[PDB]
């Protein structure tokens, strides 16, 4: 048996008071006048009564939405403090307008002001009411601000500084307060949405709230642009410069993927991309394919035409964005094809020559190599060093170009210090020619791997290539766990087996290591142990490497068990864990896979619009009126968006049902009294 | 004192969240309309 | 329902105390053997009433501590009473959410330290939440 | 310019008629009285008018649900044909009650009858109104029926014979028509649910509709007994015998998994399972495990006690279902451990004897072998040959027991045909002793593999083991494609390579086949080719098997390409395809994994309740009142169920919005005319 | 580590399948055990360059079946010195059937359920991690154990 009693007592309501709030929804007022007039002397009923649920006399009238009782109570001097917020929160326009024409317990935090609460509800009509009067909302401080009051307020009382800043940004991100009372609604949504994204990392505790607010700003910018009704309106929005396609460059700069990938914006971009061919969409796939090598095969002819006569009609083709892309791809493909001939044009006779002169294939490689190096700094100079590292494909260029430069440096260095011919069998293991041939081969892989970046143009391999790299970043997170599991077992295996290292002389065919025909010394050194464990993932390490010359097969059994336990952890467990999450991470990416590809393709297209870098790498070496026009288009767009968004809201709940009941209850009472 | 304040805010917040339709609710509107219809008809 | 529950609490009202998880007294074993499907049903009905957030926010000395003990005790019942595991687990999550929602209403840093540093007789209350595996209570951003 | 015009013309409604339908929802009757009285002479208005949607005048009156204009129209002789079905479809009890007390276009198929439509709506109140009057529903024919009229009707007109049967079963499967007007609602749901499931295969076109109807009956039976409020009621339902736990056995026969797996039925079953231990649930896992081998270790003592004194208190322990399960498991586990000792208890001196006598371990295996064979016919006899073949585990018993019988037959046969001892190296390939040992080893695997069937008792390994085999059927269904892809490539590879077969003498160590140290003749014969392609899945086939002694490395290249293409298809494509569908089929099973496990464990528990087979295989060889009680309980369950689902129905829609519109408009006009 | 418990539950079925096939292969091949002296380089077992006696003893049979999961056991270990080409075929079919069950059937079964089990875990990943980090944080709050291990004394 558990007795139950009210633990935290609260003052109860009297019998005469309880009938007052019970009859508030009814519609009789003679009780109010009789009590209030007598309240000056009799003090029979306290009008400012407090219901147990924390609701006062005035707040009931707002809840049932009836304004007739509201007028009567406001006639007498009642405590109306913090009652405006309740009217705004219910989004009842009639109640608010009456209110401006005028510790305790409250349902709202002390930092809430009526303008902030109105923006939270996103009610256009109510927001316009308050903004007409002189109303201000405080500026939020910067993300990294160490002033005298930001530190003082945060240190003295947190959970309020963090709440106040979130509430301010909630009001600023409301589409109604941006479409109204903002000079450039599109630009404001761009800056605010980007700012909120950066704030989701600094304030990691409130990640969900700030990220949701950022998506709210992004949708508003795209929804505003969705209301364009003519190509004249679309061109004005995209070409507007606050200081072509100036506004589209800003959208790309702020990572507004939804704004860019809008179908109306993409159609305009495709017009400029396909400038030469007006009907490329309607062409057959066979004729589209066959015509591809037509420009590609004649790439040198157009390239030389631009140099000798830029104004000529034949030279007018090259600066068309689609022609330029084909010419650059064809020029690069010539480099890769001519690399394939570098491994078969060298005679056997000069195989023993030390520091050879450039061959018949390397000589024609040289102009291309200088073209890439000369063009590498140009794109680095325009964006600066900081912008360089962000692009993953841009790191490949620097590593590939450095290897090419190192190859040329070593080839000439060996050409001047060696003159005679010596058989290749007795060359030193760090021979400069050997190093140069190794670096040249490595860079050949990187050069051929850059063709993946061209998949973005195609509509089939595009989305798959983009989603391929988006899930790559999840793989690197697993590589940290494996690199520590591998290190843990490699250290143990090396420590057990290093007592039995043997010289290469005693080995069968004078060979030491795991790359011999008969593998041996697989765990002799720490460097060799890591290689042995890596190759065991692919099953290329034989089991007999766990034996030793002296038959201490208690040590051999321990080594075999340690090797066996690594296989279970790495292959059975860890490898299967990577498959499990990669499938899960693929479901999320596939939902937005179309938006990312269009954003990625837009960046690819826009690089060929400008006149700079129009020549292939082999040939690389030898004001106020527009403001008002934008304003009138924005005014029309806001009108359509406000009208449309208002009735998507109007297209049921428990509270809605009560209001019908109140009207029926009220209508019954006035009819009965009428005679 | 702090616990009492938290309970009051929690009760009010969850009360409002509750009221935010049902077929049984449709009958109540039907009943009130019919009750009003007969009451006025008897009235003269 | 907060309003209806409060009305009955004003009158002298009692709820029978459920017995311990591992109980073997004279009446618990006898009642179970003569009539099952009623011994188990009665206990489930009682724990449903005790786990009501409105019956904890009202008529309880420490609503946070009561939700901690009741929520953990119900979790242990989901193993012994394997047949009714689904019903008992939903009651355990009801008490875990109530503790998290109650302290989500803090409006200042001063209020938060009072709750978290309270000792029954630093961070004494936080350690109790960790002991009872109140993951949602601990992981709230405040 | 596409002109649009009326194609299929329909007679329009006159102006005076159009005013009628618009005013039908209003509530004026003087127009009706004047027109209908004048219809005898003037014929001004045709009351039985059809609106554009085919709604006759009376039909709208039912549509707004009001009973006033419905009453007045009924007074005059309006065409009421097929109007009763419309009232039933709206689930309005007032219209139906008044309507009963009295080619063209219809929304209902001509075979639909008022009782048939009432059961479709599953309205308890409306159905009872029609059942009170003499009402019958036609009997459906059997699934395999070839009478004179069933074939004749189905031949002359399909799409109607099938429609009639589905309509009939929809009415019969309604819970309101089963919970009411049925002698035994639980048994009726069991028979009807099973019969509908069997109909989902013959009528494969309508599989979706019949499966849903069958699931409806299964849920009703579980819901009906979910309303039991005391343990006394539960035993009455479960122990009822239509002609212990007789009703529960019927449920298992009809595959009522939801009915069996309800926690209330499981609690009663668990009480009988743990009869010996009243507090097993509250015991610790340490004491539960430690006490397991207590009965297990002393299992021979209890078994012999039963034989010598069935009435003794000590001999009654084995009769308890849980102790009997432990005793059988301990006895079976002895066999497997006794098999462990047969591989080392023979001496190295007797490996050269032909047809040896049974060894020091095979002698005591013999009583175990006869225990299973003697017990196998006993269980098969009870259910017959047909019942035996359904269980997958039963096939394992038959194969394992047959192999043991063959092992004994060959051992005794070789024991008498040979007497001298001859070295094993000179024995024939088909020596009787060699065949006997091969069969003994094969059956050893089957004996040990049967321990997986014991996982059903455990609560952790139970659900996983059940779900382990539910999607094993999909794997076997995938093995048909592989078994034909393997045949296609095996035929191709054998055709090319069979001209280069070499004798074993020419081989290095007189070894031929892929099982030698150096693999050779991997594709010489069809039998060997299939083995080579099988072992290539696991990577155990070396690449040099594609070479031939005569260096025709164009034939070798083609043969290597056949081998390469098989690997791509089988490993990259086919193997990864099996993984993808295996997970997809796992999600569906994982939802119901608990229900199937409880049904599977219930069958395991109920096998030990009977007194048959009490002793382990090593020791196998040396009446009208209950109808009133069940009827009273069934009546109480129906009343609780009917009330419960009625309130659950009351827990909005566009059509519900209309009556509120009708009530307001009807109230508006009557008050307006009132003075 | 949250789905490592699921893996441990699958290891019971495999360990029973492994014991079943290790029983049959050792029951068949134990008549042909050869001493280490007769071996090529005085080496016995599956860890030699030439693998031999892979199924001679029960302890070695379990090791042989384990290494066959990773493909480190050669196919010629199913041969015997005396050319009984019926025992070899039966022994090779026992080895082949084990590979199908363990690799094609059981391993794909483990992948399927872990893939399903990851979805449920991924929902509560943040809450579980924050609770785990809180315990780590509160361990360093107390003054006890302030000194690092090497300076504990
Ligand atoms: C780590 N390990 C090992 O290194 N070797 C090489 C020793 C050579 O000297 C062994 O043979 C060895 C061993 N684990 C062993 O049993 C286990 C086998 C698998 C296990 N899990 N998951 C799996 C998941 C997917 C697929 C396969 C496995 C676990 Cl958990 C244990 N066995 C075999 C064994 C040998 C003797 C005995 Cl009495 C019992 C068992
Ligand atoms: C069938 N096949 C083959 O048998 N051999 C061995 C013959 C020598 O013995 C080959 O080398 C051979 C070959 N297919 C070849 O290219 C393809 C390679 C992979 C392909 N798909 N999916 C894959 C899916 C997952 C993982 C890997 C592959 C396809 Cl569709 C084609 N290559 C290589 C090649 C050789 C010469 C040239 Cl001119 C071009 C390519
Ligand atoms: C178990 N097994 C075996 O051990 N060997 C080697 C023994 C000699 O050393 C065999 O060659 C052998 C064999 N199963 C065989 O066919 C099957 C092949 C695959 C099967 N399933 N799923 C698969 C799932 C995924 C991927 C691959 C397979 C099944 Cl169910 C049966 N074949 C080939 C064979 C040989 C001769 C003949 Cl007349 C018929 C077939
Ligand atoms: Zn500041
Ligand atoms: Zn008790
Ligand atoms: Zn018939």
Would you list the DSSP string of A66-126?
Answer: -HHHHHHHHHS----TT-HHHHHHTT-HHHHHHHH------SS-TT--HHHHHHHHT-HHH
What ligand 3 atom has the least distance to the C-alpha of E95?
4
Tokens of D27: 């509530």
Question: Does residue D479 have its Cβ closer than 6 Å to ligand 3?
Answer: yes
- Cβ-Cβ contacts under 8 Å for D628 (sequence gap 6 or more): none
Contact criterion met (CB < 8 Å) for C112 and A159 = yes
A4 secondary structure, DSSP code: E
Q: Which atom of ligand 3 is nearest to the CA of E96?
A: 4
- Unique residue bearing structure tokens 């961070």: C123
Residue D647, CA atoms < 13 Å, CB-side half-sphere: 5
Nearest to E115 by CA among D590, D461, A464: D590
Q: Is the beta carbon of E62 within 6 A of some atom in ligand 1? A: yes
Task: Give the CB-side neighbour count of residue A619, counting CA atoms within 13 A.
Answer: 21
Nearest CA to D446 among D346, D521, D339?
Answer: D339
Query: Residue D425: its chain E contacts at CB < 8 A?
Result: 81-82
Distance from CA of E120 to the nearest CA of C (A): 17
Among D361, D303, D360, CA closest to D335: D361
Nearest to A584 among E49, E107, E118 (CB): E118
Q: Is A38 annotated as a binding residue?
A: no
Residues contacting residue D524 through CB under 8 Å, at least 6 positions apart: D494, D497, D498, D500, D501, D502
Alpha-carbon torsion A351, A354, A360, A365, what sign?
positive
The burial of A446, by beta-carbon neighbours within 10 Å (0-12 exposed, 13-18 middle, 19 or more buried), is given as middle
CA of D565 to the centre of ligand 2 (A): 8
Q: Which of D548, D564, D565, D576 to mutate to test the pocket of ligand 2 (most atoms within 8 A of CB)?
A: D564
Contact (CB<8Å) C36/D228: no
Preceding-residue numbers of gaps in chain A (C–N over 2.5 Å): 102, 243, 622, 651
Q: How far apart are CA D666 and CA A417, in angstroms?
A: 112
Distance of CA A404 to the CA centre of its chain: 34
Interval between CA A201 and ligand 4 midpoint (Å)? 19
CA atoms within a 13 Å half-sphere pointing along the CA-CB vector of E107: 18
**Helix axis angle, A526-535 to A472-497, nearest 10°:** 130
A654 three-state secondary structure = helix
Give the atom of ligand 3 at the shortest distance from the alpha carbon of D531: 11
C-alpha span between A579 and D33 (Å, rounded): 80
Contacts of A572 in chain E (CB under 8 A): 69, 107
Ligand 2: which of D568, D572, D574 to mutate, most ligand atoms within 8 Å of CB?
Answer: D568
**Burial tier of D138 (Cβ tally within 10 Å: 0-12, 13-18, 19+):** exposed
Peptide-bond breaks in chain D following residues (C–N over 2.5 A): 102, 243, 622, 651
CA of D452 from ligand 1 middle (Å) equals 20
Beta bridge partners of E45: E52
> The dihedral of CA A650, A652, A658, A660: what is its sign?
positive
Q: Which of E17, E28, E50 faces D441 most closely, judged by CB atoms?
A: E28
- Contact criterion met (CB below 8 Å) for E106 and D573: no
Q: Are D87 and D60 in contact (CB under 8 A)?
A: no
How many CB atoms sit inside 10 A of residue D368's CB? 21
Kindly identify which residue of chain A lies nearest to residue C3, measuring between CA atoms.
A53
Give dist(CA D266, CA D273) in Å, integer.
10
Phi, psi of E52 (to 5 degrees): -150, 160
* Structure letter (DSSP) for residue D11: P
Name the minimum distance, in Å, from the CA of D664 to any CA of chain B: 8
Backbone angles phi, psi at A593, to 5 degrees: -60, -30
Does the CA dihedral A420-A424-A427-A429 come out positive or negative? positive
Taking CA atoms, A114 is separated from A96, A110, A213, in Å, by 10, 11, 20
- Identify which ligand lies nearest to the alpha carbon of D150: 6
As a whole number of angstroms, the distance between CA D401 and CA D453 comes to 17
C-alpha B25/C-alpha A516 separation (Å) is 84
Of the residues E128, E129, E133, E134, the best mutation for testing chain C's interface (the one with the most C CB atoms within 10 Å of its CB) is E134
Dihedral, CA of residue C61, residue C65, residue C67 and residue C72, to nearest 10:
-140
Beta bridge partners of C14: A3
Q: In this complex, which of A1, A52, A159 lies closest to C142 when CB atoms are compared?
A: A159
Helices D576-591 and D593-607 sit at what angle, rounded to 10 degrees? 70
- The answer to whether D30 and D38 have CB atoms below 8 angstroms apart is no
Chain B residues with at least one Cβ partner in A under 8 Å = 3-4, 7-9, 11-13, 15, 18-21, 25, 28-29, 32-33, 36, 39-40, 43
Residue C87 has a CB neighbour count (10 Å cut-off) of 16
Say whether D650 and B30 touch across the interface (CB within 8 A): no
Tell me which DSSP letter residue D344 carries. Answer: T
Experimental method: cryo-EM
8 A C-beta contact, residue D404 and residue D443: yes
Nearest alpha carbon to residue E78 among D500, D550, D516: D516
Structure tokens at A570: 């790495």
Q: Residue for token digits 């288009």?
A: A633
CB contact under 8 A, E71 and A547: no
A664 vs A675: CA distance, rounded Å: 19
The ligand minimizing its distance to the Cα of D486 is 3
CB contact under 8 A, D281 and C80: yes
The pair of structure tokens assigned to A293 is 């090598």
Are chains B and E in contact at 3+ CB pairs closer than 8 Å?
Answer: no
Q: Which residues pair with A513 in a beta bridge?
A: A520
**Other beta carbons less than 10 A from residue D2's beta carbon:** 3
A148, burial (CB in 10 Å: exposed 0-12, middle 13-18, buried 19+): exposed
Q: Nearest residue CA, atom 21 of ligand 2?
A: D568
- In angstroms, the CA A436 to CA A408 distance is 8
Of C127, C130, C135, the CB nearest to E127: C135
Angle at D218 between CA D217 and CA D224, to 5 degrees: 85
Q: Please, which residues have CB within 8 angstroms of residue E17's CB and are 6 or more apart in sequence? A: D449, E98, E101, E102, E106
Q: CA dist D228 to A517, D284, D630, Å? A: 77, 32, 12
DSSP-based three-state secondary structure for D229: coil
Radius of gyration of chain C (CA): 17
The helix/strand count (H/E) of chain A reads as 33, 1
Q: Which phi and psi (to 5°) does residue D515 adopt?
A: -95, 10
Question: How far is CA A129 from its chain centroid?
Answer: 37
- The answer to whether the beta carbons of residues D448 and E23 sit under 8 Å apart is yes
CA distance D22 to D44: 17
Could you tell me if D228 and D165 are in contact, meaning their C-beta atoms sit under 8 angstroms apart?
no
Q: Kindly determine whether residue A3 and residue C14, on different chains, have CB atoms separated by under 8 Å.
A: yes
SS3 D136: coil
């Amino acid at each position: 048996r558990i007795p139950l009693q009210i633990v935290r007592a609260e003052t109860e309501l009297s019998a005469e008071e309880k009938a007052f709030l019970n009859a508030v929804e009814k519609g009789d007022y003679a009780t109010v006048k009789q009590a209030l007039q007598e309240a000056e002397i009799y003090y029979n009923v306290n009008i400012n009564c407090m219901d147990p649920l924390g609701r006062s006399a005035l707040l009931i009238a707002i809840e049932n939405e009836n304004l007739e009782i509201m007028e009567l109570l406001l006639n007498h001097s009642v405590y109306v403090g913090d009652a405006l917020l309740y009217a705004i929160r219910k989004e009842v326009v009639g109640a608010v307008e009456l209110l401006l024409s005028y510790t305790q317990f409250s349902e709202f935090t002390p930092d809430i002001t009526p303008i902030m609460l109105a923006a939270h509800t996103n009610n256009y009509e109510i927001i316009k009411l308050l903004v007409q009067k002189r109303v201000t909302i405080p500026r939020p401080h910067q993300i990294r601000c160490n002033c005298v009051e930001c530190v003082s307020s945060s240190e003295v009382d947190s959970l309020r500084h963090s709440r106040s800043r979130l509430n301010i940004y909630k009001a600023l991100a409301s589409p109604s307060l941006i479409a109204l009372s903002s000079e450039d609604p599109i630009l404001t949504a761009f800056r605010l949405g980007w700012e909120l994204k950066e704030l989701s990392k600094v304030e990691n505790e409130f990640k969900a709230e700030y990220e949701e607010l950022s998506q709210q700003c992004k949708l508003f910018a795209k929804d505003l642009l969705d209301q364009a009704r003519s190509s004249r309106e679309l061109e004005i929005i995209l070409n507007h410069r606050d200081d072509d396609l100036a506004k589209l460059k800003v959208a790309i700069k702020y990572h507004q993927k939804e704004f860019v990938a809008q179908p109306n914006c993409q159609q305009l971009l495709a017009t400029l991309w396909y400038d030469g061919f007006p009907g490329w969409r309607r062409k057959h796939w066979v004729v589209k394919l066959l015509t591809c090598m037509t420009i590609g095969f004649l790439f040198p002819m157009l390239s030389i035409a631009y140099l000798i006569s830029p104004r000529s009609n034949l030279g007018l083709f090259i600066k068309k964005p689609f022609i330029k892309f084909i010419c650059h791809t064809a020029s690069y493909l010539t480099f890769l094809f001519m690399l394939l001939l570098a491994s078969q044009h060298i005679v056997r006779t000069d195989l023993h020559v030390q520091g050879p002169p450039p061959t018949v294939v390397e000589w024609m490689i040289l102009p291309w190599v200088l073209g890439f190096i000369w063009g590498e700094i140009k794109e680095m100079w325009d964006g600066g060093f900081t912008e360089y590292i962000h692009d993953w494909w841009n790191l490949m260029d620097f590593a590939m170009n450095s290897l090419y430069l190192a190859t040329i440096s070593l080839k000439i260095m060996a050409y001047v210090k060696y003159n005679g011919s010596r058989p290749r069998e007795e060359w030193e293991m760090w021979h400069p020619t050997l190093i140069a041939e190794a670096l040249f081969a490595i860079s050949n892989i990187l050069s051929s791997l850059r063709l993946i970046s061209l998949f973005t143009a195609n509509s089939h391999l595009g989305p798959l290539q983009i989603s391929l790299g988006r899930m790559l970043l999840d793989i690197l997170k697993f590589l940290f766990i494996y690199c520590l599991v591998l290190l843990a077992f490699a250290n143990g295996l090396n420590q057990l087996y290093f007592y039995y290292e043997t010289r290469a002389i005693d080995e069968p065919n004078n060979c030491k290591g795991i790359r011999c025909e008969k593998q041996n010394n697989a765990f002799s050194t720490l460097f060799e142990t890591l290689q042995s464990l890596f190759w065991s993932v692919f099953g290329l390490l034989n089991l007999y490497v766990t034996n030793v010359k002296a038959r201490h097969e208690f040590t051999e059994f321990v080594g075999a068990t340690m090797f066996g336990t690594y296989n279970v952890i790495s292959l059975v467990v860890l490898l299967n864990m990577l498959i499990a999450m990669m499938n899960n991470s693929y479901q999320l990416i596939a939902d937005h896979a179309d938006i990312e590809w269009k954003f990625a393709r837009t960046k690819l297209w826009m690089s060929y619009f400008d006149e700079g870098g129009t020549l292939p790498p082999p040939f690389n070496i030898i004001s106020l009126i527009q403001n008002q026009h934008y304003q009138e288009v924005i005014r029309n767009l806001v009108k359509r968006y406000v009208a449309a968004m208002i009735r998507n809201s109007k297209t049921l709940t428990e509270e809605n049902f009560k209001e019908l009941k109140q009207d029926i209850s009220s209508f019954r009472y006035e009819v009965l009294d009428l005679l």
